[PDB]
Homo-oligomer: A and B are copies of this chain.
Amino acid sequence: TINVNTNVSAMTAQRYLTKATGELNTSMERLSSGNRINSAKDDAAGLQISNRLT
């Protein structure tokens, strides 16, 4: 309690900020490109079927 060498709350805040930033970047990419699935990570089966349909 009232520690110095470790700040667990700051670590959790950093983790959640990183998650928010990652989601923000993904959303920004999806907005700019105009496609929801730009890389296989977004969706595997979705990407496959979309490529076949295109």
CB distance from A54 to the nearest CB of B (A): 11
Q: Mark A25-42, 1 if CB is under 8 A from B, else 0.
A: 100110011110000000
Determine if A9 is an interface residue (Cβ-Cβ < 8 Å).
yes
> Which of A's residues lie within 8 Å of B, judged by CB?
1-5, 8-9, 12-14, 16-18, 21, 25, 28-29, 32-35
A-B contact pairs, 8 of them (CB 8 A): A1-B18, A1-B21, A2-B17, A2-B21, A9-B28, A12-B28, A12-B33, A17-B32
**Identical copies in the complex:** 5
| A21 partner residues in chain B, CB cutoff 8 A | 1-2
Q: List the B residue with the shortest CB-CB distance to A7.
A: B25
